[PDB]
């Protein structure tokens, strides 16, 4: 899915300008790529928060003078206590292309009550295609107990989403309870 | 009561650069007092017994790099 | 091409010669008044150049490679002495008078010493 965001040129730089923008309830963003100079824009705060609710969404930035262009939020600086987005790094993508992204690991398996599944990572770097971004990568540990551990080289990854990270380290662990 | 096993300290030695970059100096003028060669002697600069870098000639002091060393040179005055 | 560090994977003899050359060069440095005579003593030839280390250029040079000396029958030491005489003559021509000798990581002995004494006889002040 494509999320459309209206942005306009940002020209004032520095902490004072950023504070003024955030008080105006916008959010600064820098959009860069492998073909053109970085573009400094400001986005609507509410729209940016709604768009960034999900992880790795495909955004289209529209500037009135310019043309819509496709980007991904690569680094989102959010406030720590409040959830507000403080700054956005947008990385331009060339429609038909390939990208490296992080997809969230979750556990959807059940074992004996003695052992509890644990995730060794929050995100895994997975090389996928633009139009099919895996929302979540799911691994199921059902009927497996004791001290079995799962590394990154054995996953039921969806089609077109190759693994870019190392496959010689553990990802999921099941072990007896916190004794 | 109690007491401290500390309270001793040595007198201030007043090290550091004495003539900065571009400053005009005379021959023999001390450029930097130091312990060890944080700055090595460059062109027109001699190194003394206590690692003091001083001017071997008149000119302007510059700080630079000679091969892999931080050095202090005295460029002869134009 | 100089890199401070001795290139790794270099042969053991080459590393030893490079280290000795560097430690000699630590105090040897050629100026316009007293340029640096560098003698590279290869297994078959000796190549001598007088260098102004300030500018990084060679003023005069000589070697056994010269056609006037290739067929000059003689031992390695004799050929090195002939090279030393030639380089001294060229230094006199260029008006060098005094030089500083850089053995370039080799012992001052044999061919190197013969070349140095030949230059001294030719009239170089060192």
């Amino acid at each position: 899915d494509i999320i459309h965001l209206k942005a306009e040129q940002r020209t004032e730089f520095g902490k004072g300008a950023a504070r003024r923008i955030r008080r105006d309830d916008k959010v600064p963003a820098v959009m860069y790529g492998h073909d053109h100079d970085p573009i400094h824009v400001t986005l609507d705060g509410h729209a940016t928060l709604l768009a960034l609710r999900t992880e790795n969404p495909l955004l289209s930035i529209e500037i009135e003078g310019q043309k819509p262009m496709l980007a991904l939020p690569k680094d989102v600086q959010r406030d720590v206590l409040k959830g507000f987005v403080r700054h956005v790094d947008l990385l331009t993508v060339r429609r038909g292309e390939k990208v490296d992204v992080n997809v969230a690991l979750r556990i959807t398996g059940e074992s004996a009550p003695g052992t509890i599944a644990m995730t060794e990572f929050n995100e895994i770097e997975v090389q996928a295609d633009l139009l099919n971004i895996p929302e979540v990568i799911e691994i199921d540990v059902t009927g497996l107990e004791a001290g079995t551990t799962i590394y990154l080289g054995d996953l039921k990854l969806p089609e077109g989403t190759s693994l870019l990270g190392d496959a010689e380290d553990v990802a999921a662990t099941v072990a007896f309870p916190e004794t | 009561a109690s007491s401290s096993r500390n309270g001793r300290d040595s007198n201030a030695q007043r090290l550091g650069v004495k003539r900065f970059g571009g400053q005009l100096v005379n021959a023999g003028e001390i450029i930097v007092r130091q312990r060890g060669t944080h700055f090595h002697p460059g062109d027109g600069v001699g190194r003394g017994g206590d690692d003091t870098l001083f001017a071997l000639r008149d000119g302007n002091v510059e700080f630079g790099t000679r091969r892999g060393r931080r050095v202090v040179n005295v460029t002869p005055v134009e | 091409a100089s890199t401070l560090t001795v290139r790794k994977s270099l042969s053991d003899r080459a590393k030893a010669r490079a280290r000795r050359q560097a430690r000699g060069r630590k105090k040897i440095f050629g100026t316009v008044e007293r340029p640096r005579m560098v003698v590279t003593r290869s297994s078959k030839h000796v190549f001598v150049q007088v260098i102004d280390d300030v500018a990084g250029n060679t003023l005069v040079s000589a070697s056994t490679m010269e056609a006037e000396l290739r067929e000059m029958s003689g031992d390695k030491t004799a050929k090195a002495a002939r090279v030393g005489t030639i380089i001294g003559e060229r230094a006199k021509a260029a008006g060098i008078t005094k030089v500083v000798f850089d053995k370039a990581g080799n012992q001052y002995h044999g061919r190197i010493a013969a070349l140095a004494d030949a230059a001294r006889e030719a009239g170089l002040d060192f």
């Binding site: 720590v80 206590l81 969230a104 009550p113 509890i116 599944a117 644990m118 995730t119 929050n122 309870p177 916190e178 004794t179 | 009561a1 109690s2 007491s3 401290s4 096993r5 500390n6 | -």
Partner: protein, 136 residues
């Protein structure tokens, strides 16, 4: 009680308690956690009380991570004594907490009882803290 095996210097200056959390502002091991919204000093006794509360409420399941460590020693002037005669003897071990620091983490427990355990733990801490999760 968490006490370091050894420290380089037993008598140290008071830790800076200015600024936001330098690092460790995000969950790294567990699913839920406690995030301090205010700075302050966190002693090993308080850490142990909170950990006991969480573990006791979650019973046997789930696992708890203590992200912070009370490795900073605090000296105490000898009692009833006039000022001076050198620094005191270490008496407390604290961790330097800054706003946004994740103190405790929990995993392997349903969200509601995890929240209740975190509430029990937070009521033992000397600074304000909140329950956080990986957005569920």
């Amino acid at each position: 009680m968490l006490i370091p095996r050894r420290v380089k210097y037993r008598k140290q200056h008071h830790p800076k308690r200015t600024g936001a959390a330098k690092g460790g502002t995000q969950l790294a091991f567990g699913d839920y956690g406690i995030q301090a919204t205010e700075g302050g000093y966190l002693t090993n006794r308080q850490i142990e009380a909170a950990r006991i509360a969480m573990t006791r409420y979650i019973k046997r399941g789930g696992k708890v991570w203590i992200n912070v460590y009370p490795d900073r020693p605090m000296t105490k002037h000898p009692a009833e004594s006039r000022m001076g005669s050198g620094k005191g003897t270490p008496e407390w071990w604290i961790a330097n907490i800054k706003p946004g620091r994740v103190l405790f983490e929990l995993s392997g427990v349903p969200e509601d009882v995890a929240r209740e355990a975190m509430r029990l733990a937070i009521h033992k801490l000397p600074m304000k803290a909140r329950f956080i999760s990986r957005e569920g």
